[PDB]
Amino acid sequence: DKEWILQKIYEIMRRLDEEGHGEASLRVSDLIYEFMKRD
Amino acid sequence: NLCPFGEVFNATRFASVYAWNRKRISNCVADYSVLYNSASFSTFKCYGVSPTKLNDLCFTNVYADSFVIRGDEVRQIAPGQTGKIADYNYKLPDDFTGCVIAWNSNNLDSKVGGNYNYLYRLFRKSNLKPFERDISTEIYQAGSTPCNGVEGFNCYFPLQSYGFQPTYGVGYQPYRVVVLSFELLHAPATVCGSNS
């Protein structure tokens, strides 16, 4: 696991983009970076 | 024979940070204190000596790296830093000798509805070497299943867009960044400050 939550987080980022929440998307992108840096 | 710093700083279109541009500057004279005062910069941090000390120095080459990032990411353009931009987009060596220059470009690089011309790398299997440039767009395997070159579950396109909008907060607004490297080889130093 960890796979399922990363995918939903990626999908929220992509959806916040298309819904014009550009700043909100970038804040999730930051989380995707910090998350995948952990073992 | 003035150094063509105007072509870098006053360029119409800056590059995405993951595909950062590099201009080699040579065989010319440059007033670095005039560069310091030619515009209002939010960052002008030199790690060797100051603008005024550069004006008495000569160098073999000067490399001007330019790109656009978020204001809150300019901190990563410094030696010893880690982060999404420093790990996966543009990395400075620990022994860096040069200047990092940056200014707000919300008036140029933001757009109503979102400017998607500027990209950044979100995923990478390992951190970049100093001054390494990675422009590949292989699908990133984030999970345990192979991706076979197709986007899908835990299989992501490695690049994302900033989507700059003029109504972003200051920390998310676009900043144009110019990084100057001062190269002194065992060779004629032909890039000299205005008072060498």
Ligand SMILES: *[C@@H]1O[C@H](CO)[C@@H](O)[C@H](O)[C@H]1NC(C)=O
């Ligand atoms: C950019 O253009 C302005 C106006 O033409 C000029 O005053 C300024 O010195 C230029 N910047 C550089 C680095 O040459």
